[PDB]
Amino acid sequence: NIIVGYGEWPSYVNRFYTLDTKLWEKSSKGWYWKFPDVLTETGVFGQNAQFHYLYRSGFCIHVQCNASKFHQGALLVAVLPEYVIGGADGFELQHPYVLDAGIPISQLTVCPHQWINLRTNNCATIIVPYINALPFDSALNHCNFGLLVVPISPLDYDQGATPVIPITITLAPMCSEFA
Amino acid sequence: NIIVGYGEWPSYVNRFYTLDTKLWEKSSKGWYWKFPDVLTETGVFGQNAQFHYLYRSGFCIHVQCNASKFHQGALLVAVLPEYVIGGADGFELQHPYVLDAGIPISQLTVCPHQWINLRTNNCATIIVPYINALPFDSALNHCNFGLLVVPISPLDYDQGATPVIPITITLAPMCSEFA
Amino acid sequence: NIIVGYGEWPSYVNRFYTLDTKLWEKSSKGWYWKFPDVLTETGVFGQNAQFHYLYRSGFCIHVQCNASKFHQGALLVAVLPEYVIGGADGFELQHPYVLDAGIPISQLTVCPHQWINLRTNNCATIIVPYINALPFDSALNHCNFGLLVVPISPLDYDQGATPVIPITITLAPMCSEFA
Amino acid sequence: STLLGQLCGYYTQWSGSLEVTFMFTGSFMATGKMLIAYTPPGGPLPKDR
Amino acid sequence: SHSTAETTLDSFFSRAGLVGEIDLPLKGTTNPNGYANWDIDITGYAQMRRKVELFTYMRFDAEFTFVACTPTGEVVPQLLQYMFVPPGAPKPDSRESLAWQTATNPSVFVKLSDPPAQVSVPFMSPASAYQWFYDGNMMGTFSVRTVGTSKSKYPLVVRIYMRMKHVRAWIPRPMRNQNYLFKANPNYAGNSIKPTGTSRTAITTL
Amino acid sequence: SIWYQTNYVVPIGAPNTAYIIALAAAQKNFTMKLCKDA
Numbered sequence: 024n025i026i027v028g029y030g031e032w033p034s035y036v037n038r039f040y041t042l043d044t045k046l047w048e049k050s051s052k053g054w055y056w057k058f059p060d061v062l063t064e065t066g067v068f069g070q071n072a073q074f075h076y077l078y079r080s081g082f083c084i085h086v087q088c089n090a091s092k093f094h095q096g097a098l099l100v101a102v103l104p105e106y107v108i109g110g111a112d113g114f115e116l117q118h119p120y121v122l123d124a125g126i127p128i129s130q131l132t133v134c135p136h137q138w139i140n141l142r143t144n145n146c147a148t149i150i151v152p153y154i155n156a157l158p159f160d161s162a163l164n165h166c167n168f169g170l171l172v173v174p175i176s177p178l179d180y181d182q183g184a185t186p187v188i189p190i191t192i193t194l195a196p197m198c199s200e201f202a
Numbered sequence: 203n204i205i206v207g208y209g210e211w212p213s214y215v216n217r218f219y220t221l222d223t224k225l226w227e228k229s230s231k232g233w234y235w236k237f238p239d240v241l242t243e244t245g246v247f248g249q250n251a252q253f254h255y256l257y258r259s260g261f262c263i264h265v266q267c268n269a270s271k272f273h274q275g276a277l278l279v280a281v282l283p284e285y286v287i288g289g290a291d292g293f294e295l296q297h298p299y300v301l302d303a304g305i306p307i308s309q310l311t312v313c314p315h316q317w318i319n320l321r322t323n324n325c326a327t328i329i330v331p332y333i334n335a336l337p338f339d340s341a342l343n344h345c346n347f348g349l350l351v352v353p354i355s356p357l358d359y360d361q362g363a364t365p366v367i368p369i370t371i372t373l374a375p376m377c378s379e380f381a
Numbered sequence: 382n383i384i385v386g387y388g389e390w391p392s393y394v395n396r397f398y399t400l401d402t403k404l405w406e407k408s409s410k411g412w413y414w415k416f417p418d419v420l421t422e423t424g425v426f427g428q429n430a431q432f433h434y435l436y437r438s439g440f441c442i443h444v445q446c447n448a449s450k451f452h453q454g455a456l457l458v459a460v461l462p463e464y465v466i467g468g469a470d471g472f473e474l475q476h477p478y479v480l481d482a483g484i485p486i487s488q489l490t491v492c493p494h495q496w497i498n499l500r501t502n503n504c505a506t507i508i509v510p511y512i513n514a515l516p517f518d519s520a521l522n523h524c525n526f527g528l529l530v531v532p533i534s535p536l537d538y539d540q541g542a543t544p545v546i547p548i549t550i551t552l553a554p555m556c557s558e559f560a
Numbered sequence: 561s562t563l564l565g566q567l568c569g570y571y572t573q574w575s576g577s578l579e580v581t582f583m584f585t586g587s588f589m590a591t592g593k594m595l596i597a598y599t600p601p602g603g604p605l606p607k608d609r
Numbered sequence: 610s611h612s613t614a615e616t617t618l619d620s621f622f623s624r625a626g627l628v629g630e631i632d633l634p635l636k637g638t639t640n641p642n643g644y645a646n647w648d649i650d651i652t653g654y655a656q657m658r659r660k661v662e663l664f665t666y667m668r669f670d671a672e673f674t675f676v677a678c679t680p681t682g683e684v685v686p687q688l689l690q691y692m693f694v695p696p697g698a699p700k701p702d703s704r705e706s707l708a709w710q711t712a713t714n715p716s717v718f719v720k721l722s723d724p725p726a727q728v729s730v731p732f733m734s735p736a737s738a739y740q741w742f743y744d745g746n747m748m749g750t751f752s753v754r755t756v757g758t759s760k761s762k763y764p765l766v767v768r769i770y771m772r773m774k775h776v777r778a779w780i781p782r783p784m785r786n787q788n789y790l791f792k793a794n795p796n797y798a799g800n801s802i803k804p805t806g807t808s809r810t811a812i813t814t815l
Numbered sequence: 816s817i818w819y820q821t822n823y824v825v826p827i828g829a830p831n832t833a834y835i836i837a838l839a840a841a842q843k844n845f846t847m848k849l850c851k852d853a
Contacts, residue, residue, distance in 0.1 A: 576845030
């Protein structure tokens with residue numbers, strides 16, 4: 024299903040951007056992306072973000088993964104504003120237990136989140152509004168939030184099945200403004 | 203679904219005749235049947251066709267095949283009036299590329315046709331009216347059309363699964379007339 | 382005053398583009414520009430024209446020159462569609478008598494034209510619609526028309542006055558379309 | 561190999577819109593994704609996905 | 610069943626706690642000149658950081674109380690100044706600095722044999738709220754000295770208490786798991802990561 | 816052009832290769848002119 028972050032819709036280049044595919048392995052630890060840095064060298068949005076002095080936008084995020092009925096595992100997808108760590112290809116987690124910031128992963132469900140259980144569903148959709156202490160900001164000096172995709176239950180399969188599961192991220196800006 | 207040839211229903215012994223089963227192999231090339239020659243020594247229709255001087259009929263054709271969810275392939279079923287080649291068991295194709303007549307197979311979809319994709323469906327139904335330049339004809343000297351079942355995508359499976367897939371043809375005369 | 386070419390207004394990036402200034406001398410022969418080639422590496426219009434397959438636009442042209450009351454001379458400004466010769470800085474005329482194409486200059490008033498007499502006025506405005514045998518064309522392979530600024534009466538002054546008179550061209554696209 | 565090409569080989573000029581259909585004939589338990597792209601006249605082949 | 614007014618945000622952050630301690634010795638090298646500059650921060654109270662970092666944005670006012678005495682705990686005849694330097698103004702660098710006599714820096718002259726002084730400071734951020742996390746919070750400064758030209762005849766200690774009022778917060782976060790290493794830094798010791806709680810021998814035994 | 820977005824995922828017991836068939840046609844605004852012999 025679709026979850027709307029904090030119960031608020033975005034308000035006052037608007038197309039689908041499909042990123043490169045991640046490969047989920049038996050020993051994967053997790054990945055994260057930062058916004059708007061994920062879209063700053065791709066297309067008209069990236070051209071607009073590097074030539075304007077002020078920026079403001081919301082987002083719509085889809086996470087997908089296709090696997091067979093003989094695979095198993097579970098992922099947690101969450102959005103954390105101002106994710107300070109202690110491009111379009113993302114980064115991997117070194118210590119997923121502390122989320123690389125000294126905070127537990129078990130309480131990450133306090134944020135707008137979704138579950139991907141391979142036996143039940145294979146999609147997750149989150150709608151994020153604009154969050155800041157300022158009406159406008161800079162798209163090249165400040166990252167508003169981060170997206171996390173972490174496996175809570177490890178991927179398992181029998182020998183002879185495909186050993187890597189693809190994860191696809193496609194996102195669309197909503198109510199973007201430039202000045 | 204059901205397709206009606208040329209958008210016309212048959213107009214002015216009427217039971218189901220189930221033929222012998224064909225075995226689809228990894229190296230199969232295709233089969234064809236000729237009408238009314240396919241039904242001229244089977245039952246009351248065959249007795250009627252060899253003792254009357256004039257004949258006129260339409261047909262309804264069902265093609266079926268049962269396979270598992272671990273098999274793959276695709277067949278094209280088509281009807282070609284006056285299929286000149288350059289019984290109830292059919293004939294095999296020698297050069298399926300030219301349809302044994304010097305004409306390409308890729309344009310065979312210009313005729314009343316259906317697709318059988320093993321991953322999607324396992325049935326095809328075609329209703330054929332009477333086509334001729336004469337109101338009546340001879341059932342023992344003229345074949346009105348031919349039926350073709352050709353694999354466009356080869357049959358594939360893993361070792362240990364069943365290596366032959368059955369194809370069943372059952373047909374019923376419609377609005378048959380004799381004189 | 383303002384003249385509208387052939388009595389037609391343009392119909393179905395839209396800002397003022399001021400070009401570099403030409404210097405009118407005692408021995409000047411004349412200059413010409415070609416459209417849309419004059420605007421193909423300047424700004425958003427130039428970016429749009431090199432990345433779209435079809436193009437269609439009209440234009441509005443202003444020609445200016447400031448001189449004192451002790452200078453004299455006269456210029457003819459004219460627009461000639463499909464000006465075949467036998468960037469943003471223009472070209473000079475080698476044989477202005479034949480207009481570099483084998484045709485007399487004395488009949489150039491058959492085209493949309495204006496006169497700049499230094500003793501009377503110092504401005505000329507021409508509005509040009511889209512002229513072609515096709516609804517759309519290519520902005521990088523075809524020049525629709527050319528602009529000519531030719532001195533019919535030579536520039537004269539007394540020694541001690543400024544020996545060069547500036548000519549300024551500023552133009553704005555009208556009803557431009559891209560596809 | 562198409563009948564449209566053979567038929568337009570009997571004329572000199574033509575113009576209009578086309579449509580292409582892709583049908584997958586794998587097994588029922590196979591999954592994946594593909595990207596099908598169209599590039600307008602005058603453009604080059606994309607270098608990557 | 611208890612009341613829901615005990616868990617409001619104005620009850621969680623509701624009391625005056627010690628956030629500062631200024632020492633003005635008669636001899637030594639701690640504050641050789643009889644003055645000191647203290648930058649207003651709320652993490653002087655050791656338990657405040659984990660409590661406030663439960664949220665990303667906060668907005669509040671503050672109330673400050675100054676208690677002064679001798680290291681023994683005695684009360685003596687002395688006068689002090691307590692100047693407030695707003696964010697963006699120069700701070701004193703000597704006892705003869707001209708910053709002590711700038712009228713735009715508010716001051717509170719008071720005696721030691723007096724009830725503790727008390728002032729209110731408003732919300733001073735240029736934005737709509739403070740933030741404890743910035744992926745890419747100056748409140749002021751309190752300067753403490755002894756009034757006079759010559760040095761004081763007593764050793765003094767000044768303690769500062771802060772209470773937050775009119776509290777608002779947005780966007781909760783997971784609570785801190787590991788030991789802190791720096792100020793304004795979520796850094797942690799990567800060679801010694803500890804579980805959130807306690808462990809047991811087997812999953813089937815209580 | 817057709818690109819691979821993900822990899823080809825398949826369980827154990829199913830074939831590792833598949834085929835795609837392409838079909839082409841024309842829309843209702845297609846026209847031709849000036850017949851010629853081929």
